[PDB]
Design a protein around this ligand. Structure first.
Ligand SMILES: Nc1ncnc2c1ncn2[C@@H]1O[C@H](COP(=O)(O)OP(=O)(O)O)[C@@H](O)[C@H]1O
Ligand code: CFM
Ligand code: CLF
Ligand code: CLF
Ligand code: SF4
Ligand code: ALF
Ligand SMILES: [Ca+2]
Ligand SMILES: [Ca+2]
Ligand SMILES: [Mg+2]
Lengths: 274, 522, 478, 522
C-alpha cells in the first residue's frame, strides 16, 4: 500500500481543485489520504479544510525560530473524510524564494515521519510553473512514484504538458518516477478530447479521464468544499468518482516521450481544426 | 631608506620619520577624518554598559562571527577517507576559500575540487557541470572516491545531487560502481560542524543503507569512533593510542590525520592513510559506535541507531578528568577490556599536575568561545581546575546545548557567575570583556583583535588571549596539539597556568616598582 | 629550453584530460614569443574554468569586496548573505591602513547579515534595512556603507538598490549596493568591473558641483594599489619626494573622501591595470583626466616609471625626479651587490592573479634571476599582450592553470624558485622547491619602490638559499 | 585595606597609596639611599662597553653562576636505580638544598639522606655517622641499595668512604651483601654534571669490576644507554620510544623518569621503576654502550672502554636534525636493525615544520647558556634553522669543548658572529646582551633577571627569555618537555617560532601606531 503521487500541469489548469475533489472521492471509498501543498499560496487544502489554512510549515517555522523547532501537530490538520492536509507555504508574490521553502517543507515532513504507515495515498499538489529544482522536490528519489499531468485542449496547456514531460525525464531516468497519464480538465475547446488523446499517445501515455467543465465546481468552491461534499448527487460528483477509480486501478506508468515544437504544431493542425 | 646590513620590513620601517610625516600629511590633507578627541570619545563609549545594551539588542547585524558555513565541514570530513577527493557542487569561489582557510590553519596542502557553476548554470541547472566535473576529476586526480557536497547557490536552486550523479553514471561519464557519496550542505543552515555531520551521514548511507541484510552487530568485535569536526592532529592520535593501549579493536571513521601531516621528503602526496572503503562497509558489524562530539553528530546518531542498530552511548566529549574517565569506563564495558595500569598511571599524573598548580589557577575568570562540544569540554575542565568561566559563548550553539551547559555549571560552585550565550558574536563578547573583565579569554586567533581593543583602554584592562580552538592563524604548529584525554588535559593545563605565570611576570618586571614580587620560584 | 621541448611538454601534460577538457585547456597554454603583438593567436583567456580540474580562481565577491571595496578604511562593508564568504575573507588580504579599528576604521572586521533559511525563503531586504539602522547606532563614525552581495542575493532577486536609495536618503549617508554575486562571470575579474561601476554610479560624482577643493598643477592619484604590506605607502613617498601631491590612493589606506576628490586631479597613475582600468577610462571620458600605467617593482622599473611620470609635468618636477633617483642609487646598488651574487642565474616560475605575473619580472632580473614561466588566474588578453614583451623567448605561459598542470610543469622545468599563492605553497615545499607567496608577500614588508626592493631581495635569498632545502632526503635513503 | 570580595596579594596590594606613602617615608627617613639620579647613572654605566671590559677582567669574583656542585648530580644519578636511597656523606645542610632544588624543578618528592656530620665529626672523622647512618637508613626507609656520595666537608678531611663502608659491614651495621656503591664528589672540582659522572662510574664499578670473567661482549644482544645528567622526563621517554620503535634491545642505565613522575592516587611511593641491579651486573654483556652526553661522561667512558671492552661510538648528543640522524644510523649499525618507516616519517615531519617556519626564524640572534652537551646541541639545531647564535656561554665548559663548538660554528655560514665563552657567568652574559643585543636568550630561570635589567633600559632594549634548560622554577611542568630526537626538535622549534611571533604581536598591538602590521595571519 501507500502510493505517492504528484500533480503537475499548465498554470491555473485546475490541478488544486481536481486533486481535492479526486481526494474527497477517495476518502468516500474509505482510503486514507494526505495532501501536500507545494505552492507559495497555501490554497491546495481549502475545499478539504473548509478554510484557507494558516499554519503553513514555512510561516510556522519562521515563528518557532527554525524548522527544527517545529512539530507535525502544529501544521498537519485533518479535514473532510478524515483527509490529512499540510501546506508548504512561502513568501508573498515578488520576494523571497518559494522553491527553497518547498525543499525545506518536504524534508521536514520526511524527517518527522508524516508519511505515516497506514496512509493509502499522498498527493503532492505542485504549482503550475515549475521554474526550478525546488518544485521538482516531489519527484526526487523515494517520493512520488507516479505523476499525473492535468491539461486541456488549449494549445498553450498542451505545450506546458509536453514541456513538463521534458523536465520529468531527468528524474525518471535517475529514479523510479513514472508518468501515470494525462487528466483532461475540459475547457470547451473544439475536438478537445481528440487533442488530448493524440498528445497522450505521442508522449506514450494515456488520457486517464476527461473531467467536464461544470459550474457546480465553482458553486461548491464558493462554499469552501468539494463537489462530493457540496452535492453528492451532482453529475460532476460522479465524474470525480470515476477519476478516483481510474487512478486507483491505473497500472500504466511510463517515461515521457517528449515531442518537438514542430510535431506539436502539426498535431494541433491535424486534430485542432473543425 | 634602508641600510643593507639591517633591512626593515613594514613594522619597523614605517616608523621612520619621513614615513610618519608623509602619513600625517595624507591624513590631514585628504582623509577628512574625525578629530582624535571624537575618536577617543566614541572608543570609550564602545566600552560602557550603555553601549553593551544597544549591542545586545541587535537583530539583523552580525559583527565578527565565530562560525563558518556547512561545506567547510563537509570537506574536512571527506579528507578523512582514503584516496577521496572532496567535491563541492556549486561556485568555485567557495572552494578557493575552503582551501586557503584550511591551508592557513594546518599549513598543509588541501585538495578540494569544484564544478565551477557560473551564471548560465545557475539558470539552467548544474547537471552538465556534474557530468563533466566528475569525469574530469576522476581522470585527472585519480581518486578512489568523490565525496560530493554543496555551495549555497546549488542549494537555493535545489540542484538534485542524487539525480545528477545517477545520470552521470547512466551516461558513461564515470563507472557505475565508482563510489560517489553526497550530501546537501546549505550555507544558510547550521554551521561548518553541521556540514561535517551531513557529509558523514551521507558517506555512511552510501556504503551501508542498501546492504544491511548480511550485517550482525558485534560480529567484527570492534568499536567505531566518529571524531566529528576536529582540527587538532593530536586528538586523532590520542584516541587511537588509548584504545590500542587497552587492546581494544576500533575503527576510526573519517581519519584525516595522515593527509594533514604528510612528510616533506621531496614528494607531494595528494592522498595519505584515511578511513578505507572496506572499513565503512563493515562498520555495521561493530559492537557499538561512539560519537566523540555528540552535539554536532545528531543526524549521524539518528542514522547509526536506526539503520545499524547500535546502542550509541550517551557520552560527552572526552575532555577533562571526569569525561575522560567516563569515556574509558564505557569503552571498557562495551569491549570487555579492563582499563590498563598504563592509563591508570596517566590519569594519576594529570591529577598530580592539577594539585601542583591549583593555587595559581584558583579563581581565575575566563571568557571563552568555540564549537559546542569543544566549549563544553573546556568549561567542564575549567571547573574541575577551580577556575571561573564567566562568559561562555558559542555562536553556533542551540537551546538544548545551552540547557546542558547550564546544568554542568550549576553542578559546580565555580559556575556561579557564568553565563552561556548562543547566537552571539565576537563583538558581543568584546562588550562583555570590558563591562565584566575576565583575567584571560580562550579562543581562536580572532580574539587577538579583542585583546588589542582592551589594551587600548589601558594596560590594566588588557585581557590576554589564550590560543585554543579553530582556526589559529597567527601561531605556528599549534594544530599538532591535543585537547582530548588525559594527555590533552595535561596540555591545556600547562598552557593555562604558564599563561597566568607569564602575565604575572610581565606585571612585576618593573624595577623598583613592581619587581618586589618578581619571584624566581613560582 | 627550446620551444620545441616546451610544446612537447604541454602536449604530454594534456594527455590525461578527457577530450573536451583537453581541447579547451590546450588553448590556455603557450610558448611565449617576443614579437607577437597580439596574444589571441597564442593564448585565450578570461573564459570559464573547466569543471573539476581544481583551479585556483576565486569569485566576483572576492573581486568586489575582497580587493576593491574592503580596503576602504572609513566605510562599513557588509557581506550580504550567509555567514561564510565574509568569514573566510576576513583579514586574509594584507591591505594595510592607519586607523582606530572599530571606531573610525573597519577594514579588519567582518560585518554580515548572516542569512538563515527564512531570510532566503522570505527575502532579506527588510533585514537589510534593519541591519543598516543597527550599523548607524553602533558605529556612528562610519563614513559610508557598502553591501556586497553573496550568491543567494543574486538568485532570489532582493532589491538592494532600493534599500540603498531609501535608507541612504533617510540617514543622509552613502550606501553602495554591489551586485557581486559569486556565480557572476568566471573569476575575481568581473567583480573588479562590477566594483568600479558601483564606485562610478554611487560615489565618484558626489563633488561634481563642488569647487572648494584647492588643487595644484601637480595633483596625481594612485589607483590600483591596495597597499599590500604597505606597498602603496612606499610608492607614495617616492611620488611626493619628486614634488607630486597624492590626493588619493585607490583602496589601499584609501578613504571615501579621497575617492570623491579624485576627479580633481591632473593625472591618474594606475598600478593595477586589470582591476582599475574601468574607472580610469571613465574618468578620462567624463573629466578629461589622462591616465598612465606604471611599475614600481625593482629599481630599473621604478626609475623608468619616475622618469615617464615626471615627463608629464614641468622641468621642476623632472629635476626633483633626478634628485630622487640619485638619492636612492647607493641604496639599491648596495642591495644588488649583496644579493645578486647569491641569486644570479636562478630560475623562477610564477602564477598569480592579473598584474604581478608580469610586473615583478624586472625586479627578479634586477637580481640576475630569470623568469622561466609565468601565468595568470584571471587576466584578459590585453594583459597577455603586455606580457609577451616582458617574458623571454621560449618561456612557458599558462592561463587559469590547473593543479595537475602546474605540478607536472614544475616537475620537468625544475625551477629554483616558485612564486604563487597560499593554495600552492605547501605542495611545492613538500617537493623540496623553495616557494615564496607572491600575493601576501609571505607576511613580509613592502616590495614596491626602493625600500621594498631591499626586502624583496632579502626574502628571495632567505628562502632560496635556506639550508633546509638540503635535508629533504633522509641520509639512509639514496 | 582589603575588600573581602577582591583580596589583593602582595603585588597589587603594595601599590595602594597608603603603602606607597609609607614605603617613601621609610626610604627618606632611615635608609640613607643614594639619590635616584646617581642610581640611574650607575645603572646606565653598567650597560656600557667600558663596564663590560672591567666585568670580563674579573679573576676572583663570580656573580650569578650558571652551575651547581657535584653531589647534586650524584643524587640525580642514584635516583635512577631501583629502590636506591641517595646517601650523601657529609653535612645535612647540603641535602636540604639538594632536595628543595629538585623539588622546585620537578615539583615532585625527592628522597635523599644525610649522615649529619657536625663539628665533632669534622674533627674526629665521620666513621660513626656512616655506621649508624647506613643502619638507620636501611631500617627506616628499607632501600634495596644505598648510593653514597660526599659533601665538601668530607672531601677536605679525606674521609675514606670505602673503608668506612667496609667496616660498617664488618661490624654488622649492615649485611655484607647489601649493595653500597660510592663516589667522591668534591664541590670544588667540576660541577653537578661531574658528580653525575663520578656517581655512575662508582655504581658501574661496584657491580662490574670484580666479575668480568664470565662476561662476553654482545651476549645479551642489547645496547646500553647512559643518559647523563638529564632534567626533562621527555628525553628519557623519547629515547626509549625510538629504540623500541626500531626493535632494538636496550638497557637504560640510570632511569629516574618514574620516581620523578609518580601518580597522585592517594599513595606516596618513595621508590618507583629505576634501573635494576641485574641490569647493571649484566651490562658488560651488551653489544656496545652509547653515551648520550659525552662531554660530561668522561670518567664513565674510560671505565666502559677499559673494563667492559666496549667500543663506545663517538656520537654527539642526539639533538637537532643531523645529530639525531647520526645517532639512529649508529644504533642501526650496532644492533643490525634498519631504521623503520615510522622514524623516517617523523623526520620528514620535522623537516616540514622547519620549511613552514623558516622565514620567521631566519637571522634571529640568540644568546644562550646551559650545560656543555645541551648548549652544543642547541647551537647545532639553531644553525640548521638558519638562526644566529651570537653569545654561547657555558660556565662549566672546558677548552676542548669550546674548540669543538667553534668547529661546529665555522662549518656553518650562520656561525659567523658567534662567540663561545667558558668559565663565564650570567653577570658576564648580562653585559653581552647590552653591548651586542640578541633578539632572544635561551636558558634557565636565572635568565629572567637579565630580561628585567634589559627592559629597565628601555622596551626597545628588552631581551625576552625563552625557558629551556635547568633549573626552571617560574613556569610549571616544563620538565615534562622533550629536547632530544625529532620530537624534541619539533618542540623546540615550536617554542622558538611562537616566541618570535608573540613578541611581534606585542610590538604591533599599539592602535593607530604599530597595529598596521598586527596581521591575523603569520
Ligand atoms: N471541472 C471544472 N469545472 C469548472 N470549473 C473548474 C473545474 N476545475 C477547475 N475549475 C475552476 O478553475 C479555477 C482554478 O483552478 P485551480 O484548482 O486553482 O487549478 P491550478 O491548481 O492549476 O491553479 C477554480 O477556481 C475553479 O473555478
Ligand atoms: S590575485 Fe593582482 S590583479 Fe588583483 S588580491 Fe593578485 S596579482 Fe588579486 S595587483 Fe592585486 S593586490 Fe592582489 S595578489 Fe591587481 S588587485 S585580484 Mo591576490
Ligand atoms: S562563490 Fe564567492 S565565496 Fe562562494 S558563496 Fe558565492 S560569493 Fe561566497 Fe559563501 S556562504 Fe559558504 S562560502 Fe560558498 S557556501 Fe555560500
Ligand atoms: S652544610 Fe651548608 S649548604 Fe652544605 S656545604 Fe656546608 S655551608 Fe654549604 Fe655547599 S658546595 Fe655543595 S652545597 Fe654542600 S657540597 Fe659543599
Ligand atoms: S526560480 Fe526558484 S530557486 Fe530561483 S529564486 Fe525563484 S523560487 Fe528560488
Ligand atoms: F496558478 Al496554479 F497551480 F495555482 F498553476
Ligand atoms: Ca606543513
Ligand atoms: Ca608533582
Ligand atoms: Mg494550484
Amino acid at each position: 500500500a501507500m502510493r505517492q503521487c504528484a500533480i503537475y500541469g499548465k498554470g491555473g489548469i485546475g490541478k488544486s481543485t481536481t486533486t481535492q475533489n479526486l481526494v474527497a472521492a477517495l476518502a468516500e471509498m474509505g482510503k486514507k489520504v494526505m495532501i501536500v501543498g507545494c505552492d507559495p499560496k497555501a490554497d491546495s487544502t481549502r475545499l478539504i479544510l473548509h478554510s484557507k489554512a494558516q499554519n503553513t510549515i514555512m510561516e510556522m517555522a519562521a515563528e518557532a525560530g527554525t524548522v527544527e523547532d517545529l512539530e507535525l501537530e502544529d501544521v498537519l490538520k485533518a479535514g473532510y473524510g478524515g483527509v490529512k492536509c499540510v501546506e508548504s507555504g512561502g513568501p508573498e508574490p515578488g520576494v523571497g524564494c518559494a522553491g527553497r521553502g518547498v525543499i525545506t517543507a518536504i524534508n521536514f515532513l520526511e524527517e518527522e515521519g508524516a508519511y505515516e504507515d497506514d496512509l493509502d495515498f499522498v498527493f503532492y499538489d505542485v504549482l503550475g510553473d515549475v521554474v526550478c529544482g525546488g518544485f521538482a522536490m516531489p519527484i526526487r528519489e523515494n517520493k512520488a512514484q507516479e505523476i499525473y499531468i492535468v491539461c486541456s485542449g488549449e494549445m498553450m496547456a498542451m505545450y506546458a504538458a509536453n514541456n513538463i514531460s521534458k523536465g520529468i525525464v531527468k528524474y525518471a531516468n535517475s529514479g523510479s518516477v513514472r508518468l501515470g497519464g494525462l487528466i483532461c480538465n475540459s475547457r470547451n475547446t473544439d475536438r478537445e478530447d481528440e487533442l488530448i488523446i493524440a498528445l497522450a499517445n505521442k508522449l506514450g501515455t494515456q488520457m486517464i479521464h476527461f473531467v467536464p467543465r461544470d459550474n457546480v465546481v465553482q458553486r461548491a468552491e464558493i462554499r469552501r468544499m468539494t463537489v462530493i461534499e457540496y452535492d453528492p448527487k451532482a453529475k460532476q460528483a460522479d465524474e470525480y468518482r470515476a477519476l478516483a477509480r481510474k487512478v486507483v486501478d491505473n497500472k500504466l506508468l511510463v517515461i515521457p516521450n517528449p515531442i518537438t515544437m514542430d510535431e506539436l504544431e502539426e498535431l494541433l493542425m491535424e486534430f485542432g481544426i473543425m | 631608506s634602508q641600510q643593507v646590513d639591517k633591512i626593515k620590513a613594514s613594522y619597523p620601517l614605517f616608523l621612520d620619520q619621513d614615513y610618519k610625516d608623509m602619513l600625517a600629511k595624507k591624513r590631514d590633507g585628504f582623509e577628512e577624518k574625525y578629530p582624535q578627541d571624537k575618536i577617543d570619545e566614541v572608543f570609550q563609549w564602545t566600552t560602557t554598559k550603555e553601549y553593551q545594551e544597544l549591542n545586545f539588542q541587535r537583530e539583523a547585524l552580525t559583527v565578527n562571527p565565530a562560525k563558518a558555513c556547512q561545506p567547510l565541514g563537509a570537506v574536512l570530513c571527506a579528507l578523512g577517507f582514503e584516496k577521496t577527493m572532496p567535491y563541492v557542487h556549486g561556485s568555485q569561489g567557495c572552494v578557493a576559500y575552503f582551501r586557503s582557510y584550511f591551508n592557513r590553519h594546518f599549513r598543509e596542502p588541501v585538495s578540494c575540487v569544484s564544478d565551477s557553476m557560473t551564471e548560465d548554470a545557475a539558470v539552467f541547472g548544474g547537471q552538465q557541470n556534474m557530468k563533466d566535473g566528475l569525469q574530469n576529476c576522476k581522470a585527472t586526480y585519480k581518486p578512489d572516491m568523490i565525496a560530493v557536497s554543496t555551495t549555497c547557490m546549488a542549494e537555493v536552486i535545489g540542484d538534485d545531487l542524487n539525480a545528477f550523479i545517477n545520470n552521470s553514471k547512466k551516461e558513461g561519464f564515470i563507472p557505475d560502481e565508482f563510489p560517489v557519496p553526497f550530501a546537501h550542505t546549505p550555507s544558510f543552515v547550521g554551521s561548518h560542524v553541521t556540514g561535517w555531520d551531513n557529509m558523514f551521514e551521507g558517506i555512511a548511507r552510501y556504503f551501508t543503507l542498501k546492504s544491511m541484510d548480511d550485517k550482525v552487530v558485534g560480529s567484527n568485535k570492534k568499536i567505531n569512533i566518529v571524531p566529528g569536526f576536529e582540527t587538532y592532529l593530536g586528538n586523532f592520535r590520542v584516541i587511537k593510542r588509548m584504545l590500542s593501549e587497552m587492546g581494544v579493536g576500533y575503527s576510526l571513521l573519517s581519519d584525516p590525520e595522515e593527509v594533514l601531516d604528510t612528510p616533506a621528503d621531496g614528494q607531494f602526496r595528494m592522498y595519505a592513510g584515511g578511513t578505507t572503503q572496506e572499513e565503512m562497509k563493515d562498520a555495521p558489524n561493530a559492537l557499538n559506535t561512539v560519537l566523540l562530539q555528540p552535539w554536532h553528530l545528531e543526524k549521524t546518531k539518528k542514522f547509526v541507531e536506526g539503520t545499524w542498530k547500535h546502542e550509541v552511548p550517551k557520552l560527552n566529549i572526552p575532555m577533562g578528568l571526569d569525561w575522560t574517565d567516563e569515556f574509558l569506563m564505557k569503552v571498557s564495558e562495551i569491549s570487555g577490556q579492563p582499563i590498563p595500569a598504563s592509563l591508570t598511571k596517566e590519569r594519576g599524573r594529570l591529577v598530580d599536575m592539577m594539585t601542583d598548580s591549583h593555587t595559581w589557577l584558583h579563581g581565575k575568570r575566563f571568557a571563552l568561545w568555540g564549537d559546542p562540544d569543544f566549549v563544553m569540554g573546556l568549561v567542564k575542565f575549567l571547573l574541575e581546575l577551580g577556575c571561573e568561566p564567566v562568559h561562555i559563548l558559542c555562536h553556533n550553539g542551540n537551546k538544548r546545548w545551552k540547557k546542558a551547559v547550564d546544568a554542568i555549571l550549576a553542578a559546580s560552585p565555580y559556575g556561579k557567575n557564568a553565563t552561556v550565550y548562543i547566537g552571539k558574536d565576537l563583538w558581543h563578547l568584546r562588550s562583555l570583556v570590558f563591562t565584566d573583565k575576565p583575567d584571560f579569554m580562550i579562543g581562536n586567533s580572532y580574539g587577538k583583535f579583542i585583546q588589542r581593543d582592551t589594551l587600548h583602554k589601558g594596560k590594566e584592562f588588557e585581557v590576554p588571549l589564550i590560543r585554543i580552538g579553530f582556526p589559529i592563524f597567527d601561531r605556528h604548529h599549534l594544530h599538532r596539539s591535543t585537547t582530548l584525554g588525559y594527555e590533552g588535559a595535561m596540555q591545556i593545563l600547562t598552557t593555562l597556568v604558564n599563561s597566568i605565570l607569564e602575565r604575572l611576570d610581565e606585571e612585576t618586571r618593573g624595577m623598583q616598582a613592581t619587581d618586589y614580587n618578581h619571584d624566581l620560584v613560582r | 629550453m627550446s620551444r620545441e621541448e616546451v610544446e612537447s611538454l604541454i602536449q604530454e601534460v594534456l594527455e590525461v584530460y578527457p577530450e573536451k577538457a583537453r581541447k579547451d585547456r590546450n588553448k590556455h597554454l603557450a610558448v611565449n614569443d617576443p614579437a607577437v603583438t597580439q596574444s589571441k593567436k597564442c593564448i585565450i583567456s578570461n573564459k570559464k574554468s573547466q569543471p573539476g580540474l581544481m583551479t585556483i580562481r576565486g569569485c566576483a565577491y572576492a573581486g568586489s569586496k575582497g580587493v576593491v571595496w574592503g580596503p576602504i578604511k572609513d566605510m562599513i562593508h557588509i557581506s550580504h548573505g550567509p555567514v561564510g564568504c565574509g568569514q573566510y575573507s576576513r583579514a586574509g588580504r594584507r591591505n594595510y591602513y592607519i586607523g582606530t579599528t572599530g571606531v573610525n576604521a573597519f577594514v579588519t572586521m567582518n560585518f554580515t547579515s548572516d542569512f538563515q533559511e527564512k531570510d532566503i525563503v522570505f527575502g532579506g531586504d527588510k533585514k537589510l534595512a534593519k541591519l543598516i539602522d543597527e550599523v548607524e547606532t553602533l558605529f556612528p563614525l562610519n563614513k559610508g556603507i557598502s553591501v556586497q552581495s553573496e550568491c543567494p542575493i543574486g538568485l532570489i532577486g532582493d532589491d538592494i538598490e532600493s534599500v540603498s536609495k531609501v535608507k541612504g536618503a533617510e540617514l543622509s549617508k552613502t550606501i553602495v549596493p554591489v551586485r557581486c554575486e559569486g556565480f557572476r562571470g568566471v573569476s575575481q575579474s568581473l567583480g573588479h568591473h562590477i566594483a568600479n561601476d558601483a564606485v562610478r554610479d554611487w560615489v565618484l560624482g558626489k563633488r561634481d558641483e563642488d569647487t572648494t577643493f584647492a588643487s595644484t598643477p601637480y595633483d596625481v592619484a594612485i589607483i590600483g594599489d591596495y597597499n599590500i604590506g604597505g606597498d602603496a605607502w612606499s610608492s607614495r613617498i617616492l611620488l611626493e619626494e619628486m614634488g607630486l601631491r597624492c590626493v588619493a590612493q585607490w583602496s589601499g589606506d584609501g578613504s571615501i573622501s579621497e575617492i570623491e576628490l579624485t576627479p580633481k586631479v591632473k593625472l591618474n597613475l594606475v598600478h593595477c591595470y586589470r582591476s582599475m582600468n574601468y574607472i580610469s577610462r571613465h574618468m578620462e571620458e567624463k573629466y578629461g583626466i589622462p591616465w598612465m600605467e606604471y611599475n614600481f617593482f625593482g629599481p630599473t622599473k621604478t626609475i623608468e616609471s619616475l622618469r615617464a611620470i615626471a615627463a608629464k609635468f614641468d622641468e621642476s618636477i623632472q629635476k626633483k625626479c633626478e634628485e630622487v633617483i640619485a638619492k636612492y642609487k647607493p641604496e639599491w646598488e648596495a642591495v644588488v651587490a649583496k644579493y645578486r651574487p647569491r641569486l644570479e642565474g636562478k630560475r623562477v616560475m610564477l602564477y598569480i592573479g592579473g598584474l604581478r605575473p608580469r610586473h615583478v619580472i624586472g625586479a627578479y632580473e634586477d637580481l640576475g634571476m630569470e623568469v622561466v614561466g609565468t601565468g595568470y588566474e584571471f587576466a584578459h588578453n590585453d594583459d597577455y599582450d603586455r606580457t609577451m614583451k616582458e617574458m623571454g623567448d621560449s618561456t612557458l605561459l599558462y592561463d587559469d592553470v590547473t593543479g595537475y598542470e602546474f605540478e607536472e610543469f614544475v616537475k620537468r622545468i625544475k625551477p629554483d624558485l616558485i612564486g604563487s599563492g597560499i593554495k600552492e605553497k605547501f605542495i611545492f615545499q613538500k617537493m623540496g622547491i623553495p616557494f615564496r607567496e607572491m600575493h601576501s608577500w609571505d607576511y613580509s614588508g613592502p616590495y614596491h619602490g626602493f625600500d621594498g626592493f631591499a626586502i624583496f631581495a632579502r626574502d628571495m635569498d632567505m628562502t632560496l638559499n635556506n639550508p633546509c632545502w638540503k635535508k629533504l632526503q633522509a641520509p639512509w635513503e639514496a
